[PDB]
Amino acid sequence: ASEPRAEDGHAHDYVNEAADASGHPRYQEGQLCENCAFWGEAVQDGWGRCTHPDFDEVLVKAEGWCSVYAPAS
Ligand code: SF4
């Protein structure tokens, strides 16, 4: 459905703003959920799904990021 907007730190070091993860060793800039290889699709107001069972439970922000991120290039 319109699953609840994901918590900062829901799982896998996720942040609602990619930029927050500047502190995270695995982070590189430009990487947003919307450009994640595991991106599902955008659902609503800068929120969309993420194709991981350990994620899709909650609606991830398009500008979010997590450590399971893999680039789509
Ligand atoms: S794997 Fe992570 S970075 Fe990628 S869309 Fe899902 S929550 Fe976002």
From Swiss-Prot:
Residues 3-23 are annotated as: Disordered. GO terms for molecular function: 4 iron, 4 sulfur cluster binding; electron transfer activity; metal ion binding. Keywords: 4Fe-4S, Electron transport, Iron, Iron-sulfur, Metal-binding, Transport. Residues 3-15 have a biased composition (Basic and acidic residues). InterPro entries: High_potential_FeS_prot, HIPIP_sf. One of its GO terms (biological process) is aerobic electron transport chain. In E.halophila, two HiPIP isozymes are found. Specific class of high-redox-potential 4Fe-4S ferredoxins. Functions in anaerobic electron transport in most purple and in some other photosynthetic bacteria and in at least one genus (Paracoccus) of halophilic, denitrifying bacteria. Homodimer. This is High-potential iron-sulfur protein isozyme 1. It comes from Halorhodospira halophila.
